[PDB]
Design a protein around this nucleic acid. Structure first.
Length: 497
DNA sequence: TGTCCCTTCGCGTCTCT
DNA sequence: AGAGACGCGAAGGGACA
């Protein structure tokens, strides 16, 4: 948007304003979101057929249009969607959301067109479910994954003895075509030579960049075992758990350095690299471990804990940066900050804690101890933000104590629990006669949302299990193990009674 | 410059157990 | 309770027209 022509760009700001206009109603964040990954052709196209997409047969929502648009070749997809959505939904049985899901990717046109062209031959001749075809296609380069699945599924299943589930698992990723081809080539080589169960070979391929990881494993598997004293199992961990090529390479490169000079066990090095962006975590503990754990206060064990997660790099960097301010200015022990950072999205929690500790403690009346409990979970940021937002409405409109709201929030998926309590606490308490503290009890666990959702569905529309269990029982189960422990009981009557 | 494809990395939620 | 699977999606890069 720099150097090609004098004057104009007048037509661009004309449309940019009108998209705030009624059909779509886009905010600033959305427009820039489109502009960035979709380009201007995208922004133009959105405008161009903003009415056509909102009503008509399509009846897409605004956020759906935005989703489709904000990708390389967005214009192309938006067009192909208008054209093919109804035929895919009617003549092949898909939901609109499924069509949108296929479209909301780079090269959406190609995916949509290839789905239409091959959803039958796959479902009929290879016995795949349409869910599975959508899964393969709902990615970048879906056309290629689809096309490759067709070509290699017979060969992979007969010759190399794989389930279709496994082929799908492989293809249902970015660069499936690659992962598939690379497996075909390297399945025999990896199996009889480097001694790996086919299950392990599929494990590795069933991530993004699987081709890389397969190739890199074959190459580096011997080395890492003899020279660096790892097990084949440990090597496969690193390769399958997200690290891929990058992590394997980085392990080789930094295993001696981290063990000898920085004093870690090879167990800990493997734990760190067996993750997404292992490379990043390893390089981030090579530096930063000294200054963290020898000036910034912590023990190696604690540093290994923070790094042994997705985005460990981010966590370490934001710990090192905010450990002083949080300890000093907000009065938290290092042990609390480590707890906050030792989760997925540590960076996000620490930063959110920083900006909301005061707010929660002043305006909403909470101990810091409570805030840290909320923050010391997966998706801490989300809970904190949701607590702030929903604490008042829960306490007033639904009559809960703060201590209850905090208890709900203090689990992985806190946000979801809170939101779901708000939704269902009414219908549960009046229509089916549960008592708030029961509803809170159910919710105050991991998987609290689906626990609730699951417990409602049971009462409102009783299944074969004809009562058998009373309401008070179901609640006990639901607290005991949520949806699993509910589906499990259901599945102890279906073919039974 | 836009479109398509591939790889790497990070965030959030649930379940195993 | 913590570890690990899963889903979702941003971000970065390469190839080609």
């Amino acid at each position: 948007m720099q150097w090609s022509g004098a004057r104009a760009l007048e037509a661009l700001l004309t449309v940019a304003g009108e998209l705030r206009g009624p059909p779509l109603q886009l905010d600033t964040g959305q427009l820039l979101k489109i502009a960035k990954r979709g380009g201007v052709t995208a922004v133009e196209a959105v405008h161009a057929w903003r009415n056509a997409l909102t009503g008509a047969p399509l009846n897409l929502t605004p956020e759906q249009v935005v989703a489709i648009a904000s990708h390389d070749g967005g214009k192309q997809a938006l067009e192909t969607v208008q054209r093919l959505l109804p035929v895919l939904c009617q003549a092949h049985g898909l939901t609109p959301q499924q069509v949108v899901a296929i479209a909301s990717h780079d090269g959406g046109k190609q995916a949509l067109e290839t789905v239409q062209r091959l959803l039958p031959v796959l479902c009929q001749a290879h016995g795949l479910t349409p869910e599975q075809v959508v899964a393969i296609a709902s990615h970048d380069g879906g056309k290629q994954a689809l096309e490759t699945v067709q070509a290699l599924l017979p060969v992979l299943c007969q010759a190399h003895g794989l389930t279709p589930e496994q082929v799908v698992a492989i293809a249902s990723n970015g660069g499936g075509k690659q992962a598939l081809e690379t497996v075909q080539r390297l399945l025999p080589v990896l199996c009889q030579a480097h001694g790996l169960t086919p299950q392990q070979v599929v494990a590795i391929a069933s991530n993004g960049g699987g081709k890389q990881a397969l190739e890199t494993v074959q190459r580096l598997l011997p080395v890492l075992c003899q020279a660096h004293g790892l097990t084949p199992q440990q090597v496969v961990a690193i390769a399958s758990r997200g690290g891929g090529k990058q992590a394997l390479e980085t392990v080789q490169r930094l295993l001696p350095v981290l063990c000898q000079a920085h004093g870690l066990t090879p167990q800990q090095v493997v734990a760190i690299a067996s993750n997404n962006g292992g490379k990043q975590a390893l390089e981030t503990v090579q530096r930063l471990l000294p200054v963290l754990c020898q000036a910034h206060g912590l023990t190696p064990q604690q540093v290994v804990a923070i790094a042994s997660h997705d985005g460990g790099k981010q966590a370490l960097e934001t710990v090192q940066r905010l450990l002083p301010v949080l300890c000093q200015a907000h009065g938290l022990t290092p042990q609390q900050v480590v707890a906050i950072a030792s989760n997925n999205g540590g960076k996000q929690a620490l930063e959110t804690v920083q900006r909301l500790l005061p707010v929660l403690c002043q305006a909403h009346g909470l101990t810091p101890e409570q805030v840290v409990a909320i923050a010391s979970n997966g998706g801490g940021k989300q809970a904190l933000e949701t607590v702030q937002r929903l604490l008042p409405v829960l306490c007033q409109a639904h009559g809960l104590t703060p201590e209850q709201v905090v208890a709900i929030a203090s689990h992985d998926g806190g946000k979801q629990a809170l939101e779901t309590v708000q939704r269902l606490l009414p219908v549960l308490c009046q229509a089916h006669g549960l008592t708030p503290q029961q509803v809170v009890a159910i919710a105050s666990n991991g998987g609290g949302r689906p626990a609730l959702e699951s417990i409602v569905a049971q009462l409102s529309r009783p299944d074969p299990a004809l009562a058998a269990l009373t309401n008070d029982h179901l609640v006990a189960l639901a607290c005991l193990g949520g949806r699993p422990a509910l589906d499990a009981v259901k599945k102890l009557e279906h073919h039974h009674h």
